[PDB]
């Protein structure tokens, strides 16, 4: 078997392969996560250099891991499929042994552990992917939003963004998001998410994807017209 230690320390104490995997994440299309009072919303950028696409069959950016948890990402698309698959398998395995679906923290901790393993295993390179994992624990109404990255560290976020120009949208969220009072409703949360993406995206046509997750396995993806209404509303208020 191929054994080479690809991820290793450098004189200054850095693991360059892990840090270069972060650059792949920085290249990826922007993804944003904002959690409200009774919901979480995952927003995703789709680059518009690709026309003549078939959006029916093209892989969606947000993936269901179980009926109650979702996973979006930024970075290498092929790499993300491997993490999603493993996560989906662990979700079913947890239901089988514990007789209870995974918590969002547990599912995140597993995905983060897989990513970490690939940073000190021989013959493999790290995942060029950072994920946003969102959902609701079984029989719980408290919203959960977690982030993971190639190194394997994970943490909980009131709101967070990853991908290209993420530092711009993080700047936006840092001043626009109030800890004392999060978005009280679904509409407020979606709007703040769309607003944050409109700082970076370009046009609000078929470039923005929005997915809303609510308690007790209530997940739905918004259509073009539904999203376009938020884009139309925000721009009219902006001209002031």
């Amino acid at each position: 078997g191929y054994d080479r230690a690809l991820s290793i320390f450098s004189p200054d104490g850095h693991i360059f392969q892990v840090e270069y995997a972060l650059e792949a994440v920085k290249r990826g299309t922007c993804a944003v996560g904002v959690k409200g009072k009774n919901c979480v919303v995952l927003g995703c950028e789709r680059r518009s250099t690709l026309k003549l696409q078939d959006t029916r069959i093209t892989p969606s950016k947000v993936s269901k891991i179980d009926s109650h948890v979702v996973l979006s990402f930024s970075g290498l698309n092929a790499d993300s499929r491997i993490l999603i698959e493993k996560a989906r398998v662990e979700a079913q395995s947890h239901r089988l042994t514990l007789e209870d679906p995974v918590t969002v923290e547990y599912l995140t901790r597993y995905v983060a552990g897989v990513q970490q393993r690939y940073t000190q295993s021989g013959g493999v390179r790290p995942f060029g992917v950072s994920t946003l994992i969102a959902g609701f624990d079984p029989r719980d109404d408290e919203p959960k939003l977690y982030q993971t990255e190639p190194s394997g560290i994970y943490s909980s976020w009131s709101a967070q963004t990853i991908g290209r120009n993420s530092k711009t949208v993080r700047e936006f969220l840092e001043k626009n998001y109030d800890r004392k009072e999060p978005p009280a409703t679904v509409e407020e949360c979606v709007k703040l998410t769309v607003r944050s993406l409109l700082e970076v995206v370009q046009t609000g046509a078929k470039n923005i994807e929005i997915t809303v997750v609510k308690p007790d396995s209530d997940i739905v993806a918004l259509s073009s017209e539904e999203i376009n209404q938020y884009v139309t509303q925000i721009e009219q208020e902006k001209q002031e």
Binding site: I8, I15, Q120, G122, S155, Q160
Partner: protein, 235 residues
């Protein structure tokens, strides 16, 4: 390139020495040992204000009588903790007793040098292991990726370690109470931390024979922070 398990001309392993540089970049972690207990404290260091700081888990339980604080590439610590927990529980299963703090530390340090061309690189994280047993009482251990461990009366690791260690040299004596040690960790953390110390960006914990390993609440730590500021102004 070059081998992973190569010696330098000075007689040190390159990869082990480079992992020590990674640990210097990590957030500060301090431990102090007394006859009334061992205190463990860490700098959380949130990268952004949107990050929910209570999800930052840099102090960890291994067993009821053993606790652990970390510094460096903290993702690497997960498998070390998992091993420590299994070692502690497995020993209880085989011998119907609590496992010695030293024996636990030694078991964790056996993983350290199991790398080469086993895992592909050394761990990029240092651990402070604190605990109590009937034989050697309250103990504090510093476990490195070199596979070496030292017992300490007090110890600081991370970015502000050399400055904090010099401070611990002057302040520590053999008659320190637990309350005195708690304040001392908070005092020294506030000195070396970049951002201003409060209950949200710094965490305290302790291990006592009676109550075992306990991570302090943000409400409890906040009162100790307030008690500390008043005592420094009082002279």
């Amino acid at each position: 390139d070059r081998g992973v398990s190569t010696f330098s001309p000075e007689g040190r392993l390159f990869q082990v020495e480079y992992s020590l540089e990674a640990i210097k970049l990590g957030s500060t972690a301090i431990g102090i040992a007394t006859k009334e207990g061992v205190v463990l404290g860490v700098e959380k260091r949130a990268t952004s204000p949107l990050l929910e700081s209570d999800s930052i888990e840099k102090i960890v339980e291994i067993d009821r009588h053993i606790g652990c604080a970390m510094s460096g590439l903290t993702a690497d610590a997960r498998s070390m903790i998992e091993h420590a927990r299994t070692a502690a529980v497995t020993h209880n299963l085989y011998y119907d007793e609590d496992i010695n703090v030293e024996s636990l530390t030694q078991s964790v340090c056996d993983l350290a040098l199991r790398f080469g061309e086993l895992m592909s690189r050394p761990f990029g994280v240092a651990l402070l292991i604190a605990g109590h047993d009937a034989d050697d009482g309250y103990q504090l251990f510093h476990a490195e990726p070199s596979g070496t461990f030292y017992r300490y009366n007090a110890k600081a690791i991370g970015s502000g370690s050399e400055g904090a260690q010099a401070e611990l040299l002057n302040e520590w004596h053999s008659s320190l109470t637990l309350k005195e040690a708690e304040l001392l960790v908070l005092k020294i953390l506030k000195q070396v931390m970049e951002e201003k110390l409060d209950e949200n960006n710094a965490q305290l914990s302790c291990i006592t024979k009676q109550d075992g390993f306990k991570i302090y609440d943000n409400e409890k730590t906040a009162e100790l922070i307030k008690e500390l500021k008043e005592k420094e102004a009082a002279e």
